[PDB]
Write a protein that binds this ligand. Structure first.
Ligand SMILES: Nc1nc2c(ncn2[C@@H]2O[C@H](COP(=O)(O)OP(=O)(O)OP(=O)(O)O)[C@@H](O)[C@H]2O)c(=O)[nH]1
Ligand SMILES: Nc1nc2c(ncn2[C@@H]2O[C@H](COP(=O)(O)OP(=O)(O)OP(=O)(O)O)[C@@H](O)[C@H]2O)c(=O)[nH]1
Lengths: 359, 360
């Protein structure tokens, strides 16, 4: 069977997506697209189509290298206008039509551990058009809810709007679809979840499968940080010898072998250090994500932060409240950043006391 | 020739320091400010000075008896049961200033400056009238009460408390030379001298005014304490450049007590007075702060413009800016941010203070 990967300019976490595309940003020393295609190759999908409407030549580049690395083919669906999230299915519809076999369609912003063959089992057990994945959240008033009958998993109704408490369960971003669904899908830029899932739930074709746990949509920067926390938890009780252990290391940290840490510094819990980063002496880093080539100078304090590529955080810099730095941001010595989403190629010489955007 | 120091009571401003030790007893560049005034006063040649205290301060009593043995000048202590203000202390010690017909100094405790005692005696002897006032420049006339002055005599025609008319640049410097007749005016009930006694003295024009050249600061408040510490280290660099401590990780004019211990690989920036017995650990940046005695600042901290009290414990990766006055025996937990936090003594902070407020 084949699989779609859903293109263009993820508007959230904007200081990272302005430099490289949203599926290409490193999530625990690996791009999220690489995670999804590793799990797809572990499932057994022989080729996977990655729709892209934003002109992404570097995604062509690294993806051709990954075709050559991993042993599965990849087809490149290219759109000149944004066709949304259903229009990518109808552009590549003659490829999914020439084998009558159910195909995955995947969102890129979702990290979890992926029950692909169990969802194939489920789609083979219920035996209709399309199946969804659903998960639990703590906050029903932020996401659209799905009603689910016990022992069947059928979706009676699909609600986009909260505040009614009809359901706990939330869309998880994987769908499994038949080609008859693809007959229904339409080339003009409509999104799939807005109507094509609404008539399919109204007609009752849609069924729902539930995950165990560890789901995150990391389309937002604070959601990126909570997803990185839960991914380091899942790496802790799945691959405990891949996380780095040390005397000045607290909790679960992921450190790349090209990364260097100076001595007498306290790397706190839940932080991924990218390849080639330079941490000097006296730097406390808890709950942050430091992408590639980002040098953090001595005696800094960093909590809940996204440090972009080729950054230079100076000495005695305090950064808290998920301040995202873009690419090549030069933070001067002895500053304080709180909520500062800083655009790429900026130089900061002033403290940012409340959350605002620096451009 | 004698002198009187007004050191009565609790200075409301800089209240987290005044709550544990008295205001003249607070360490100003590793020395109490009253030791500064009595040491320069003994450099003048005054044989005994009187200090008039309303607050019971037994620690000031025993510290001054020690300093009496130290410098070799006598000290009698005027004791008040209720507050007598600033004119009442003159009237309670009025016979000890009335024994001998000779002009005496009276001196505010909060003033730190470069003390021209001999030139002031020469100016008072030259002009030959009742009272002599030191005046100074300020950059900011709309906070402090102004004094008019004619050139080449220095007489004060008019004493104005309220600013915002710009009739004068100069303001009072807390330094007066008074004759015994001025004391003969002063009554025993608690008025303050600068509010009426100097006003009628200037009204019949007996008051004369003398200018300094520079380096004056009333340090009653905490931000004024910091900027007076900065200007004192300026003047002390320019007179005693051997006494400030030079180092590779030391920037600017830094005074460090010999009992202080400074850790490896830390940059202590300009205008820092480090008290006796303080422990600065590795990677700690201190600029423009004054750290009073026995206070420990743990590793990788950042400190700008701050007053760290006695026996404090500033933790690790704490940032302290915008005058975060710590009292005595304040522990600050690690990884916190203090901005404007005037913290009362014996407090433990586990919460970041983002805006200036008082912690009690
Ligand atoms: N290739 C193509 N991909 C698209 C287009 N629009 C959305 N996508 C993809 O649709 C997937 C899911 O949509 P969203 O969750 O809203 O993500 P997004 O489009 O990045 O938008 P934000 O994350 O809110 O900034 C994402 O992986 C997008 O890359 C498009 O017009 N062309
Ligand atoms: N001994 C005695 N000293 C007094 C009394 N009132 C004021 N003083 C002293 O008067 C001097 C100058 O007065 P201020 O400049 O207003 O200082 P302060 O009384 O400490 O008040 P603040 O500094 O604003 O808190 C200070 O050195 C005080 O110690 C008093 O009632 N008894």
């Amino acid at each position: 069977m084949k699989a779609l990967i859903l293109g263009g300019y993820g508007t959230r976490l904007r200081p990272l997506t302005l430099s490289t595309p949203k599926p290409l940003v490193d999530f625990c020393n690996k791009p999220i697209l690489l995670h999804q295609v590793e799990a797809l190759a572990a499932a057994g999908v022989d080729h996977v189509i990655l729709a892209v409407s934003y002109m992404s030549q570097v995604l062509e580049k690294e993806m051709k290298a990954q075709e050559q690395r991993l042993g599965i083919r990849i087809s490149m669906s290219h759109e000149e206008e944004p066709l949304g999230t259903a229009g990518p299915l109808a552009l590549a519809r003659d490829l999914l039509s020439e084998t009558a076999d159910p195909f995955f369609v995947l969102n890129s912003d979702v990290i979890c551990d992926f029950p692909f063959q169990a969802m194939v089992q489920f789609h083979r057990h219920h035996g209709q058009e399309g199946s969804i994945l659903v998960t639990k959240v703590e906050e029903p008033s932020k996401y659209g809810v799905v009603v689910c009958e016990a022992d069947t998993g059928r979706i009676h109704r699909f609600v986009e709007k909260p505040q009614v408490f009809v359901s706990n369960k939330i869309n998880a971003g994987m769908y499994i679809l038949s080609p008859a669904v693809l007959q229904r899908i339409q080339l003009q830029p409509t999104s799939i979840e807005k109507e094509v899932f609404p008539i399919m739930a109204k007609e009752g074709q849609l069924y729902a499968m539930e995950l165990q746990g560890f789901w995150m949509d990391i389309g937002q920067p604070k959601d990126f940080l909570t997803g990185m926390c839960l991914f380091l938890q899942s790496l802790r009780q799945k691959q405990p010898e891949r996380l780095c252990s040390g005397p000045g290391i607290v909790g679960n940290v992921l450190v790349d072998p090209s990364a260097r840490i100076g001595q007498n510094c306290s790397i706190g819990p839940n932080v991924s250090l990218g390849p080639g980063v330079v941490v000097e002496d006296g730097v406390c880093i808890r709950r942050c994500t430091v992408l590639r080539d980002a040098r953090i100078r001595s005696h800094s304090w960093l909590e809940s932060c996204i440090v972009g590529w080729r950054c230079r955080v100076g000495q005695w810099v305090r950064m808290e409240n998920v301040t995202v730095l873009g690419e090549d941001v030069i933070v001067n010595d002895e500053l304080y950043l709180n909520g500062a989403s800083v655009l790429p190629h900026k130089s900061i010489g002033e403290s940012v006391p409340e959350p605002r955007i620096i451009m």
